[PDB]
Every structure is written in C-alpha cells, then in structure tokens.
C-alpha cells in the first residue's frame, strides 16, 4: 500500500516507505503567460528531472533545533544550469524528495519543511516550523519525506541570481536513538526536481 | 466587507475610493474542511 | 584583428625628405597615419580612403602626401619640407570618416616607426 | 492626572557631569513631550531641553547646545538629561515637564501642563 | 426639531486633486460655437503613437553615420524613458510626468543614402542580465533582434518588447546605480557597400498596449 | 483516534468522541479583513516619510499579526498630523517631486488629515521578507505606499483596506520565565 513511484521526465524514484505527498500552498501552478512577459515566454521540458544533493549527517549528539537549510535554485551542473545563466527571466516550481535512511530499530524525529522567502529563525521561532508545507522522517515509520510546491513571489517571472524564493529546511525534532542493533548514523540526501519551467528574455552569448 | 458598519451607499465612485482589481481561492480554509475526524479502526461503545 | 608592420623612419637633418611604408593584412579599410609627439597626445595627421579621396591636418597639409597601393596591401607617406616639430613615433592603423578624421582607437598599434628630425 | 517622577539630582563640582531622569505616573498612548526648565538663584523658570516621544526630535537653549544630551527610552517611558562640562552658571533647581495638548516643534518650549516638583542642583567650583 | 449631524474630523480640507466640484457664481454663459474645430487631441499617447520624434546620438545628431573601420556598434542605449538618447523626445517628455509605465515602444529607422550606397543593419534587444552590452553582431545574435537592408522602401520599425519580472517599471532612472533595470538596444552595422558617409536616422513612438500609470509633478519649480 | 503522525494531515478530533457535543461557533473577530482594519500608530516620523507598513510596531495588533504572512495586498488610509501643507506622491516618484503642488497636497485643517490611498506598488504583492537583493534585513526599495511630506509631521496613523494575507509565518506571544503561567494585571473595578 506504501509503494509510491514519481516519474519527472526521464527518471524515476521508488519508494516503498511511502507516507503520501504533501502539496504546499496550491495543487497546480497559477496562469503562467501574463502581461509582464508580453507574449515571449517558452516552456523547456528537458530541464524538468531530478539531482542529487547531500544535506548532512544526522549523528546522535545534535539536540532539537538543529536547522539545515537549502536555498533553490542551488548550484545547476546540467540542462537547469545553462537555462539560469542564459535566459533573463524564469519560474518554476520545486517537487522534493528526502530520504533519511537507518533502520526501522532506531529512533528519532526529522521535520522536512518547505519555507519561502527565508530568513534566519530564532530559537523561539523553531517551535512553529510546521506552518510551512512539511512532513517528518521517523525510522520507525518511514524513511522518505515528498512535497511539491507550486511558483510563488511579488513577481511573475524570477532573476534567479538575485532571488531565491523558496527554501529546503530539515531540522532535529527529537534526537537520534541508536541501540546496539541500530544504525549508528544517518546520512540525508535531497532529490529535487523543477517542475513548469519558463524561460523569457534570451541573453546573448559570451563567447 | 470587514469592519465597516453604514448601511447608506457611499458618496465617492467605487473608481475613486480604492482601486480596482484586474484578473488573468483560500487554502486553509479547504485545509481545514478536509481534515479528518471520527476515529480509526474499530469501535466498542 | 589586422597585422600591421611600418618601416622608412630614421634620422634626418631640416629640410630633408623620408618615405614611410607600412603593410597590413586584413581587408580594405580606409588607413591612416598617426604619431604621438613627444609628451602630447596622440593625433591623427594624414588619411586616405579605398582607393581615392585623401585629407590632412592643417599644419602638415601641402607638405605631405600619402599613397596607397591596393595590390600589395601596403600605403605610403612621403613627407617633404620637414622641420623639428615632427618628430615622433608615427603608427598607422584604420582610421573612419577621413571627411572629419576621425581616428579609430579600436585595438592595439604596432610600435615600429621612429622619426627625429635634427637642426 | 499624570505625575512626574525625577531622578539624579546632586551636587557635583565643575568639569564633571550629572544625568536627570523623569518618567510620568501613566502610560497613556499620546505624543508627550518632555522637557526640562531650570530657575536659576534669584531668577526666573527658563527653558532648557525638550524631546518628544515619537521621534527623537530635540530642542535646546542657546545656552546649552553643545554640552547636554537628551534622550528617551520607548521600553521603560523615561528621558534622561546627561549634563556635561557644568559651569558654575549652571547651579539652579531643575524641573521637568509634560505638555501634551500640541506636539509641534515649533511650540516646543512655550506650554506645558504638568511640571513635577523640581530637583536641585548646585554646582561648585 | 432638525436633522442632527456630526461634522467629522480629518475630513474637509482642501486637496488639490480631490474629484468634487466649487459652487457657482456667474449663470447663464453660452460660448461661441467650436464644432468641428481642427487638430483635437483627447488622449496623449495617441499623439505619442501617430507622431515619433527624433533620438539624439553624439554630437547631438538623430542619426548614425556608417563607420570606415573595424567597429560594428553604431550606437547603443538604455531601454530607459530617462536615457540620453531620448532625452529630446516627446515620449520622453510625456513620461518624465508619472511614475510607471508598460507596454512596446517602437523604433524607426530611416535610411537617408544615395541610390548607389547599399547596406544591412541589424538591432537587438539586450535584457539585463550581462554587466556590459554585446559590441559584435555575431555576438548580439543570440538576443531577440531583427536584419534588414535598404532598397525601395527606406523605413523600418522595430517594437522593443516589454519584459520584465514586475508588471511596471519606473520611468526614472533611480540613483549613480549602474546597470540599467531593463535591457539596451545595440545597433550594429553587418555590412555595406560605398556607403562612406551615408546616415540612418531613428526615431521613436510608443506601441500599441504602451501605458503611463500615475501622474506626478517632479521637476523644480 | 489514531492516525499516521508522519504524514502531515490535518485532524481534527471532536468531544463527540466521549460523548461531548461541538457546539455552534462565530469567527467574526478572527476574520483577516475584520482585524487588519484599525488604526495603529508609526512612531518613527520624519519631515519627509515613506509609507513602508515594516514600520509599525512589530509587537502591536495589526504589525504582529502583518509579520505572521509572507505576502500581502491593501489599499491604505492614513492620518497624519502635520503643520503646513502635507504632499502625496505615488511609488516610483522622484524625491523632488514632493515639493510640488501638482501632486496631491492637503492645505492642513484644525484638527489633522485623513485620507485613502490606492495601491500603487509596481508588483501584484507586496512582502514582508525577501531572500535577496534587488539591485546591480533590507526589503526591495519599492516595497512602499508612497511618501509624505511636511514642514514637520507630529504623528502618524495607518490603516489596511481590503486586506489579504498569503503564507503564514510563526507569531510569538511574550515568554513565561519560571512561572506555571503569565501572570497579569486584569481590569477589575475599585474598592
């Protein structure tokens, strides 16, 4: 019942610890074509499909409050990439996928958060992170978090270099419990992938 | 309609009180509907 | 962008004559010849157009005479009548609207030409 | 209504300095401003320093311009007068005030409403 | 007895754009009848659009002079209603007196040289982006542009679009900041032929979804 | 009930699960355009002011319960207190346009000025925080209603119409030191 497979563009991900997916804010992007772009926006579906990133290591002695952040768009090596540095305008949105993988006899609590327009947290404001679209990693439960967020911001269109409306944030609810025959540590990664990528204003070359 | 309390049409033109709105959904209000209630399993009264 | 030598500078005494040359390799622009005077600004002196028109600066006009010759891609200018005032380093590079002579400081200068005028 | 508190007073010798304080007894929501009158010995009340509440606007005396400082605290509803480099001019009986009816600068040393009773101070040389 | 009424406070005073009316004073006017008076204008971007005034480039010419040399780049300028370049135009004139603005602005380029004198111009439009502007054609190929060159029919308009992250722009340019908030408009010159000293004037108008949004009043007065 | 904890859905369990009965409730005060329609103060006045609403108290009614979105829309309403006349000008204008009197200017009446603006900020919202800059802790400059000015301004009043709030954000209340709770002083008649 808990096998979930995602399919953006060319690449896939199972998963068999599958909680459900949580949609943030929306279940589908607003009009993307509006006046500010006057008519000269495309679509590039060759961009929509996932990467990799490491996050941290989820060892013992990190207390609650341990906050990672992850701002998006981060560093593209691929198609996403050239797409950044050479169109003037783009939009998009983000579908994530977290994987914290131990065993099912460790113990513990993660919050997956998707905050946007981000801004350092204090130790007071932490206990509210679950206003944002979330979801938790427990070993006991499951070992995969999948949210998907739409496009959202004062502008239609986005000058990635400049801003970065939404941000990643993984923090320690409840610290790590490992026993003898548990996992002594966890590693957590990131499986990002854009979704309706637009591009307008085509910048010339540098060649 | 929030926080206004007189019942007569106002003096000045909708186009001059505030300004208009053009077009090209509350969220929580429908995540707060579908949320789930009742119980979970079976039940022995 | 073009490959520019220049060659005929030298020393001479008042009065007397020289023949600079300078070959060049890429297409046909309108070429001219500059020189920066001793502690003064570069300034341009004599240009010529593709194959005609030619124009001078009012001091050195009537004793100078540029040339061009298309086929082996070289120009020339005979300078007559010399006097201790022209003594510089003469470049020579493109040089647009010879009407108004106005110089082009598109690129690099070859450094190849050195005049002194003696007296 | 409203009572004024002062605070700070002494004697001190010239050269060194002194801080006044005074807080009201209420802390209603008005644009007060505070502000300081000294009666010098055998003359009359005089304007010294004013400031209001809601920005930090300050007026002086032509006497005291470059040496007193006045400030306000938004957290605990005080106004502090640092006295620096007295004079021996500067011996008289200090008093605060409130004036709460008009908040404009340029009235903001010619009415006010409630003084406080005044603290004394007398410097010696 | 009579009608109670309470004479609010904070309203009243005189603002000097308020949409309410004066009373009269003087009845019974008629005017001298001006029916079908000649040259109305009702709106002023209909002026802007049927009327394009000249650009100003150096030396104060509103043309480009074909260039015996290596450099491609005729001219170049800001896409700014505060530009230099349109310092002298009635688009630009009109837009100094609000705040934002929206929509195409068309260019004109008229190629005023002999029959004999041929050539192929190019312009491209430059969003920002990059910190400087392209200065080769081949270079500059990769923005949204548009060739042509002259013959019968000596007029081209290009219509520069509007692009952008917010609906409006500022018709001011802000402070000593660098890098104009939008784009440039490069220029360039492919080729020609016995074209020495031959011109091309250009002139701009407004397009036809142009807009200005909020009248100010900003000169020293 | 029970349910999957890590899934993130909303439950909302009633006291009909024990017998109980959800009686009928009324949210008129909790209504977003409800509360944002006040008055509240800017204690931070100048000879020249612009409207930025990041300038109300973040501790108050409606600044706190600004700070609680990421994102907003609203019309506005001010009343400022002035001497002279008060000029107006939109967002985007020059600095030296409010000296003019083309734009609108108040000639001042006994008491102060009331008046409503529009929304004229170039974007379709305007936001409480921003990841990053917007040139070649700091909000876009043109994040603003506009500008005021006047020979000196005593205070300033602002008000929020037709209010919409995107995004939530966390809203404090004051921290318990070592109590078992925040003990206050509440209204209570005399003798």
């Not at chain 3, 540029?66 to 086929?71: F, K, M, P, Q, T």
């Not at chain 4, 409130?98 to 406080?116: C, E, L, N, P, R």
């Not at chain 6, 008055?39 to 612009?50: A, C, D, E, M």
């Not at chain 6, 917007?134 to 205070?155: C, H, M, V, W």
Request: glycine share 8%; net charge neutral.
């Amino acid at each position: 019942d808990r096998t979930l497979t995602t399919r953006n563009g060319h690449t896939t991900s199972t998963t068999q610890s599958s909680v459900g997916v949580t949609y943030g804010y929306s279940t589908g992007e607003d009009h993307v074509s509006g006046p500010n772009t006057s008519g000269l926006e495309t679509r590039v579906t060759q961009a929509e499909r996932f990467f990799k990133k490491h996050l941290f290591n989820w060892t013992t002695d990190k207390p609650f409050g341990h906050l990672e952040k992850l701002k998006l768009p981060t560093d593209h090596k691929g198609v996403y990439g050239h797409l950044v540095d050479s169109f003037a305008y783009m939009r998009n949105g983000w579908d994530v996928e977290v994987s914290a993988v131990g065993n099912q006899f460790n113990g513990g609590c993660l919050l997956v958060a998707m905050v946007p327009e981000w801004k350092k947290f204090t130790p007071r404001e932490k206990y509210q992170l679950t206003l944002f679209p979330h979801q938790f990693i427990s070993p006991r439960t499951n070992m995969t978090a999948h949210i998907t967020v739409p496009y959202l911001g004062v502008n239609r269109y986005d000058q990635y270099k400049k801003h970065k409306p939404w941000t990643l944030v993984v923090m320690v609810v409840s610290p790590l419990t490992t026993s003898s025959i548990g996992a002594t540590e966890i590693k957590v990664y990131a499986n990002i992938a854009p979704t309706h990528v637009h591009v307008a204003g085509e910048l010339p070359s540098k060649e | 309609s929030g926080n206004t309390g007189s019942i007569i049409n106002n003096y000045y033109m909708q186009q001059y009180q505030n300004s208009m709105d053009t077009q090209l959904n509350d969220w929580f209000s429908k995540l707060a509907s579908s949320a789930f209630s009742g119980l979970f399993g079976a039940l022995l009264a | 962008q073009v490959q520019l030598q220049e060659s005929g500078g030298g020393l001479v005494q008042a009065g007397g004559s020289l023949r600079l040359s300078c070959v060049y390799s890429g297409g046909a622009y309108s070429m001219g010849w500059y020189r920066q005077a001793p502690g003064k600004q570069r300034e341009l002196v004599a240009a010529i157009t593709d194959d005609g028109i030619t124009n001078y600066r009012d001091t050195v006009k009537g004793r100078f005479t540029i040339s061009r010759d298309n086929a082996k891609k070289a120009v020339y200018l005979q300078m007559n009548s010399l006097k201790p005032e022209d003594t510089a380093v003469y470049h020579c590079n493109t040089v647009r609207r010879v009407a108004t002579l106005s110089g082009s400081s598109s690129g690099s200068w070859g450094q190849g030409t050195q005049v002194t005028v003696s007296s | 209504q409203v009572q004024l508190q002062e605070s700070g007073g002494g004697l001190v010798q010239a050269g060194d300095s002194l801080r006044l304080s005074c807080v009201p007894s209420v802390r209603t929501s008005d644009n007060y401003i505070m502000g300081w009158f000294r009666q010098p010995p055998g003359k009359e009340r005089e304007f010294v320093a004013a400031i209001r509440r809601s920005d930090g606007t300050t007026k002086y005396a032509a006497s005291v311009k470059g040496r007193f400082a006045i400030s306000r605290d938004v957290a605990k509803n005080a106004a502090y007068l640092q006295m620096n480099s007295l004079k021996a001019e500067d011996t008289a009986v200090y008093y605060c005030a409130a004036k709460y009816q008009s908040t404009f600068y340029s009235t903001m040393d010619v009415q006010y409403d409630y003084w406080g009773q005044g603290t004394q101070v007398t410097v010696s040389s | 007895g009579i009608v109670p009424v309470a004479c609010s406070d904070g309203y009243g005073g005189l603002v000097t754009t308020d949409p309410k009316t004066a009373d009269p004073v003087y009845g019974k006017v008629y005017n001298p009848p001006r029916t079908n008076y000649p040259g109305r204008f009702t709106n002023l971007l209909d002026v802007a659009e049927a009327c394009p005034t000249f650009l100003c480039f150096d030396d104060g010419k509103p043309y480009v002079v074909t260039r015996e040399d290596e450099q491609r780049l005729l001219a170049k300028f800001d896409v700014s209603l505060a530009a230099k370049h349109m310092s002298n135009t009635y688009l630009s004139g009109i837009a100094q007196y609000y705040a934002q603005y929206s929509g195409t602005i068309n260019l004109h380029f008229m190629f005023t040289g002999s029959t004999d004198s041929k050539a192929r111009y190019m312009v491209a439009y430059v969003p920002p982006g990059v910190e400087t502007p392209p200065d080769t054609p081949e270079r500059a190929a990769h923005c949204i542009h548009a060739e042509w060159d002259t013959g019968l029919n000596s007029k081209f308009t290009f219509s520069i679009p509007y692009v952008s992250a917010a609906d409006y722009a500022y018709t001011a340019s802000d402070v000593a900041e660098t890098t104009n908030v939008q784009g440039w408009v490069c220029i360039y010159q492919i080729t020609h032929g016995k074209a020495q000293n031959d011109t091309l004037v250009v002139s701009v108008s407004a397009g036809k979804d142009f807009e200005l949004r909020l009248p100010i009043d900003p000169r020293t007065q | 009930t029970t349910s999957a904890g890590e899934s993130a859905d909303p439950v909302t369990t009633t006291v009909e699960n024990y017998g109980g009965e959800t009686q009928v409730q009324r949210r008129h005060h909790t209504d977003v355009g409800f509360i944002m329609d006040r008055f509240v103060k800017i204690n931070n006045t100048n000879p020249t002011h612009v409207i930025d609403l990041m300038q109300t108290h973040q501790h108050g009614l409606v600044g706190a319960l600004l700070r609680a979105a990421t994102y907003y829309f609203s019309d506005l309403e001010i009343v400022v207190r002035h001497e002279g006349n008060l000029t107006w000008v939109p967002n985007g204008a020059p600095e030296a346009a409010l000296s003019n009197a083309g734009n609108p200017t108040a000639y001042n009446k006994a008491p102060f000025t009331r008046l409503a603006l529009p929304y004229t900020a170039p974007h379709r919202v305007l936001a409480t925080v921003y990841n990053g800059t917007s040139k070649y802790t700091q909000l876009p400059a043109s994040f603003n209603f506009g500008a005021i000015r006047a020979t000196d301004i005593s205070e300033l009043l602002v008000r929020m119409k037709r209010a919409e709030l995107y995004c939530p954000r966390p809203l404090l209340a004051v921290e318990v030191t070592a109590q078992d709770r925040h003990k206050q002083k509440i209204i209570a008649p005399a003798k």
